[model samples]
Target: MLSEQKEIAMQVSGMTCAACAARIEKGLKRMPGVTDANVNLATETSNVIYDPAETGTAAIQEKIEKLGYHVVTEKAEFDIEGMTCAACANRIEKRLNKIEGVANAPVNFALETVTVEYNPKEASVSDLKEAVDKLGYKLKLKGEQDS
Candidate 1:
């Protein structure tokens, strides 16, 4: 559903000239989780490349329909490895919930998974995976190979 590169772009609502275009470019460049950002001022488009994750198109476009800025406030499930105990599950659960723009973050010890509903504007699966990795675990998209 998504391309190999994280390069993403959409129309900017109020872009009129280099001013607005530059500002939007600034916004994306400074956007957390976005490693890099670019703008096609002539075409009125902004793009960014963040961390990489294998995901579906269904969860990548909904939030774009709701705002002038493109954001995908969609859900994804993660299959976690190296997670042990309900405490680890509960621990990682709240940490994920606290991530900005994440709406739903629930973890299951039995399933070793976390179902997260997050906005790409604030973060991405790379950020999520990094977070888990920092906590001594690893995560992969539940859909990639379904664990």
Candidate 2:
């Protein structure tokens, strides 16, 4: 039987240009056990898939920053809007970084989006959304049934 594979949502930072996004995505993919790194230039988000046993949030965060970017916060990208300016971005970024299970928070000004890669098995979306709200931003979850 094939072992079940798990996907964690990560939030990375410090990609003001498409090249930055591509660089980050490539950096993440270089990490051991990281199968894929999907970074949306338009959304300013990166979704990373990895093996929990081989690597974790902290490991991935380190890799992202080592590539010369910031790992501000890590939260699910359900839905986000009205986020502009570095100060405003930093506000949410700082808040999300404090979460216990968050790995990295990638916030991009040019892309106008945030990608939060986290261990769902370790943290919940509700907790993440609440954190974002505390920073004065609204959380637009992706779907019904708390998905």
Q: Runs in model 1 with CA error above 4 Å?
A: 1-72
Local distance difference test, per candidate?
0.59, 0.65
Clashes counted in candidate 1 amount to: 0
Q: Score candidate 2 by TM-score against the native.
A: 0.48
Question: Each candidate's TM vs. the true structure?
Answer: 0.48, 0.48
What tens-digit string does per-residue lDDT give for candidate 1 at 20-43? 666655654553445565666656
Worst 10 residues of 1 by lDDT: 55-64
| lDDT tens digits, residue span 113-137, model 2 | 6666664444576787688777777
Best by lDDT: 2
Q: Give the residue spans of candidate 2 off by over 4 A.
A: 74-101, 104-147
